[PDB]
Symmetry: none
Subunit: 28 residues, 4 copies
């Protein structure tokens, strides 16, 4: 359960990073 | 613990992401 | 100005959450 | 196994985050 939780939290971060890259593209 | 260490590393990363999103918001307002 | 404001509100909130997660992680090492 | 994989996934993320700060720096001078 502890590892499962961590892998889901890491997965979430990748989506936040992806979004930021698109938002920078918009604003460059 | 290896797990304790990891939770602190995740926390740190989220702080760095938060900071970037502030900088972007600021830039968009001009 | 509208989305600009709301994106700043969101950014501020994520900074607060990051800070809290760090303190929870640390509290566990205590 | 599990931990090795997580630590490498975390390391990778910090690399992507670092790269983004290089772009922000550029934009805040432009
Ligand atoms: Na966990
Ligand atoms: Na967890
Ligand atoms: Na994001
Ligand atoms: Na630019
Ligand atoms: Na986050
Ligand atoms: Na940062
Ligand atoms: Na933002
Ligand atoms: Na969010
Ligand atoms: Na806080
Ligand atoms: Na804190
Ligand atoms: Na990764
Ligand atoms: Na990147």
């Amino acid at each position: 359960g502890e590892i499962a939780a961590i892998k889901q939290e890491i997965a979430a971060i990748k989506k936040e990073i992806a979004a930021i890259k698109w938002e920078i593209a918009a604003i460059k």
